[PDB]
Amino acid sequence: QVQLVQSGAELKKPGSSVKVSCKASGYIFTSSWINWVKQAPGQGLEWIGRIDPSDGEVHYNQDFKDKATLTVDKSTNTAYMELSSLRSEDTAVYYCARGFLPWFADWGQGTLVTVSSASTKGPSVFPLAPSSKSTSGGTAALGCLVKDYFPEPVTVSWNSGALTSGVHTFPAVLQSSGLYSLSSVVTVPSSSLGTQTYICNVNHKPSNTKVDKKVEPKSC
């Protein structure tokens, strides 16, 4: 069957350029156009342009005329898209998609391009300690704040994977510093607070930073 296989995620500084690839399998490459589509985070789909692998005939969305360059190497069944003069607004997942008839059946898996002037940094992990008294019963919340890292992602587990029920790990927010911050919490029986240990296991692979933070009562 048909597969479109795109290149991996890119992290780029503003002003730079990037070239993203889309390798096609399972059909005659020169028999269909390759289309490119942008999906900025939390947003919809924007069509960039298309290219005919047979001869390189290319058509662009004019909003991308000074941004994107589409090429193809028919000899390796691959289409490329180059983005120039990268800025923050170019941060998106970019998809290629095979186009024969006026619809897009076969899509690549997407390539995330993130544009940022930030540099790699492992997180500080701070405790969200379960309160002295409060709630509306016999459940307490605790957690870890995973602060000031770059880039995404970060993983969090609790008790080495032994604790999953009640766990919520939130989407990171991007701070004005250029660094991310994320929280992970868990709700547990308040009677468990004195006897059961709770450790959040944080791994930020890009900075090679792993931390195990034991979280316990001690605010007041």
């Binding site: 897009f104 602060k147 989407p171 709700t187």
Partner: protein, 214 residues
């Protein structure tokens, strides 16, 4: 050029419901309209092409109709695998364009959040910054408002929040909000409050602590 306007933006529905999503083109597109399904982290998947044709493999519960400027996608009986975002798109003229999407999420009974507030750790305070966190746990629907107050002053512009995807077991949402102040500012005030407004709460819930302990 041709704008595609989808409605509703969000649709709440139950397994077994008949669901209809609407898409309006700003110019005539004949029947060159397609519908796509997208789930988080995944590429869009084609459901319907040519306004009304089911793509190969697509279950029969999916259909579409319309011509000219008005189009619909219908799911005749909603299944657990169908909660996702749906996009329409026109391929009548270049540039091809798409609607802004309709998220179909799971309807359930309204549930108020449990709210928890967390002071900044001493460990963090040593670095010159304070992060105060407010958790709103397991609520429905998604719409919720956090108001941070510091010695009764409403704080604005110095917080960020995020929301989990709908829970696969109980269909609720959770939200985490962080208020960030300098250590110097943190130590100038006493009462830190997170005030939560939600349609499940008859009146706002406030959780607070006084800096210093108790």
């Amino acid at each position: 050029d041709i704008q595609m306007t989808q409605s509703p933006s969000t649709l709440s529905a139950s397994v077994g419901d008949r669901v209809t999503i609407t898409c309006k083109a700003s110019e005539n597109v004949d029947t060159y309209v397609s519908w796509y399904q997208q789930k988080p982290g995944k590429a869009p998947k084609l459901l319907i092409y040519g306004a009304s044709n089911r793509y190969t493999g697509v279950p029969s519960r999916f259909s579409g109709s319309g011509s000219g400027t008005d189009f619909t996608l219908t799911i005749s009986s909603l299944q657990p695998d169908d909660f996702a975002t749906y996009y329409c798109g026109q391929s009548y003229n270049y540039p091809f364009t798409f609607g802004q999407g309709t998220k179909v999420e799971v309807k359930r009974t309204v549930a108020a959040p449990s709210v928890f507030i967390f002071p900044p750790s001493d460990e963090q305070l040593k670095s010159g910054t304070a992060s105060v966190v407010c958790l709103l746990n397991n609520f429905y629907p998604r719409e919720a408002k956090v108001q941070w107050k510091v010695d009764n002053a409403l704080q604005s512009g110095n917080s960020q929040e995020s929301v989990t995807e709908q829970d696969s077991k109980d269909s609720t949402y959770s939200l985490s909000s962080t208020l960030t102040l300098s250590k110097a500012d943190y130590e100038k005030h006493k009462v830190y409050a997170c005030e939560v407004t939600h349609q499940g709460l008859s009146s706002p819930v406030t959780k607070s602590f006084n800096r210093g302990e108790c």
